[PDB]
Ligand binder design. Structure first.
Ligand SMILES: Cc1cc2nc3c(=O)[nH]c(=O)nc-3n(C[C@H](O)[C@H](O)[C@H](O)COP(=O)(O)O)c2cc1C
Ligand SMILES: [Ca+2]
Length: 166
């Protein structure tokens, strides 16, 4: 039903959504969610298409809640198929996301004109709606070494998360 309800009943405070077509963003999401345990927290990865992201407004019910988005960009700067509902919702919504804390890691390739469009958009839109960005937008480049871009981001991400939540 609701992802916030699932997190509450399974003890998770971190949820990582993945916008993926070929599985790269899903694997990064799984890796980030497992990392949570190394810092005394608990996370889970999730396919946004299976949920209603309007529920983000209920996230502040969970202590030290953090939502992370690992999003790939396809086509003409389009979202992946599984992130279309989320993309559509983001464009038309006006909900207040005060209290929400987020971070975004975008998967793209610098050779396309619309480099990491999806990741850049989600990052910008969440802040516009009232959410608080806890760590800078990661811009992974699949034309170079995406894996290394991810590791560099992740290496600095956790210390920042720990710093923020104490
Ligand atoms: C057919 C196709 C089109 C792509 N189009 C874009 C694009 O317009 N912008 C961009 O930054 N990256 C683009 N990329 C590259 C990616 O988003 C990169 O491969 C990402 O790692 C894919 O993640 P995923 O496995 O989770 O689906 C494209 C990749 C493919 C195969
Ligand atoms: Ca506010």
């Amino acid at each position: 039903s609701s992802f916030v309800e699932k997190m509450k009943k399974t003890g998770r405070n971190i949820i990582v959504f993945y916008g993926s077509q070929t599985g790269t963003a899903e694997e990064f999401a799984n890796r980030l969610s497992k990392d949570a345990h190394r810092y005394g927290m608990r996370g889970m990865s999730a396919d946004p298409e299976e949920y209603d992201l309007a529920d983000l407004s209920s996230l502040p019910e969970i202590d030290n809640a953090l939502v992370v988005f690992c999003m790939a960009t396809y086509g003409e700067g389009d979202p992946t198929d599984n992130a279309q509902d989320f993309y559509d919702w983001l464009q038309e919504t006006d909900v207040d996301l005060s209290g929400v804390k987020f971070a975004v890691f975008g998967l793209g390739n610098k050779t396309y004109e619309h480099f990491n469009a999806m990741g850049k958009y989600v990052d910008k839109r969440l802040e516009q709606l009232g959410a608080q960005r806890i760590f800078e937008l990661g811009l992974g480049d699949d034309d170079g070494n995406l894996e290394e871009d991810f590791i560099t981001w992740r290496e600095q991400f956790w210390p920042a998360v720990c710093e923020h939540f104490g």
